[PDB]
Amino acid sequence: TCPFYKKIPGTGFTVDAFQYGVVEGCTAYFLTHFHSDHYAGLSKHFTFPVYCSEITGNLLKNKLHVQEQYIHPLPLDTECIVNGVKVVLLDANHCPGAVMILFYLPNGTVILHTGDFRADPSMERSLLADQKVHMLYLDTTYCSPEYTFPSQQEVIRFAINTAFEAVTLNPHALVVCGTYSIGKEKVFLAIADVLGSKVGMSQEKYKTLQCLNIPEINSLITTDMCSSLVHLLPMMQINFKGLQSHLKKCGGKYNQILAFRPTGWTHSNKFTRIADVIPQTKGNISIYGIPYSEHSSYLEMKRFVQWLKPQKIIPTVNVGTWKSRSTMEKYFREWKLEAGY
Numbered sequence: 001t002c003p004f005y006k007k008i009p010g011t012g013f014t015v016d017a018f019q020y021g022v023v024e025g026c027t028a029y030f031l032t033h034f035h036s037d038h039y040a041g042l043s044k045h046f047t048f049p050v051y052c053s054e055i056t057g058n059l060l061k062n063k064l065h066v067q068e069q070y071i072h073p074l075p076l077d078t079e080c081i082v083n084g085v086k087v088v089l090l091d092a093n094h095c096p097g098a099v100m101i102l103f104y105l106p107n108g109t110v111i112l113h114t115g116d117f118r119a120d121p122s123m124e125r126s127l128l129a130d131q132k133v134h135m136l137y138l139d140t141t142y143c144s145p146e147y148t149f150p151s152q153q154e155v156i157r158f159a160i161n162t163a164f165e166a167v168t169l170n171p172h173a174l175v176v177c178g179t180y181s182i183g184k185e186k187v188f189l190a191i192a193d194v195l196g197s198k199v200g201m202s203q204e205k206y207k208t209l210q211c212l213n214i215p216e217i218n219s220l221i222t223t224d225m226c227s228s229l230v231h232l233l234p235m236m237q238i239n240f241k242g243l244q245s246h247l248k249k250c251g252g253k254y255n256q257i258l259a260f261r262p263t264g265w266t267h268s269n270k271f272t273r274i275a276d277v278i279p280q281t282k283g284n285i286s287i288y289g290i291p292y293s294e295h296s297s298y299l300e301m302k303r304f305v306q307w308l309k310p311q312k313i314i315p316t317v318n319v320g321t322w323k324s325r326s327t328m329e330k331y332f333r334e335w336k337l338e339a340g341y
C-alpha cells in the first residue's frame, strides 16, 4: 500500500509511486527521474497520465515503451497548470532529466518535493527564492555528518589527469568506466574529451544516451568499440576476472586497462582525500573507486534546508527503520534551533 510520503495532500497527485497498482484517488502520477527504484512498475500498459521532464519522457517512450498519449512532459522553470493546480519543475542536479516539483495547493499551502537531488547554492536563486514553502519532501540518502565527499568538479579534475597521464605513458592502454543506470555521464565524457576519443559502448547504452538531449552527442559517442579508447562496461563486470575477459575481446589492440568505478560514499571517505586515492592492482589491470556523488552531502543538505526554512520536513530515504527515522528528526531539530526558524 502506497506510503503517505508518496502522496501530496489536497490533490489527486502521487510521486514516484508506480509499483502499487492503481492508487485509489490518484488522477496523476509524477515521476521525478529515470531510476528504477523510482519507476518500478511502469510499462507499455500504463494508461494514466504521467507528468515528467522531456528527457524522462524520452526514456519512458523508448526504453519502457510507454504510449506517447500517457506521457505529459513539462518544461522546467515554467508555471504550468495540472488538473487545476499550479506546478513548477526545477532541475534537481541529480541525473539527466531529474527534477524537483513545486506544488501550489488551492488552500495556499506550498510543497517542495526534491525527488533525488544534490543540493546546490544556485537553487537559492531559482523560482524558490520567490515564496514560502511549508512542507518539504526531502532526499535524506546522506543525512548524517560522516557523509562528506568532494565536489563533482574536483573528482572530474582527478579523473581527467589520471587518464591523460597513463595514456600518454602507454598509448596501448585502454580506459574503461563502469555504469549501471543513467547518471554520472560527465566522468566518461570528460575523460574521452581530454584523450581525443568518442566513448564506445554497447547498443542498449548508446540508445539510453541518445534520449538525453545532450548537445553535440553524435560527436561524443559511438557503438564501434575498436575505433574508441574509452569504453563503457556494466558495473558488475568491472573487476579483474571480468576485465581480463574484456581485455581478450579487443584482440591484442591494448596491453593495459585503466578502469574507474564511480561510487557513492564508501567508508574510506572517512580517512582519505581525493588527491591521495589509489587503485587495486592485479597485473596490468588498475581500478579506481572515485566518489562522484549525485546526492547531497550532509553539509549541502543542511545548508539548503536552513535557507529554505520549511515549517515541516518529510523524509523519502532511509525511512524503513525506527532508528534511521529517529536520528533524522534529531538533525532536523538541531538545524531549526541553530537557524531560529
Ligand code: NI
Binding pocket: 033, 035, 094, 116
Ligand atoms: Ni536516483
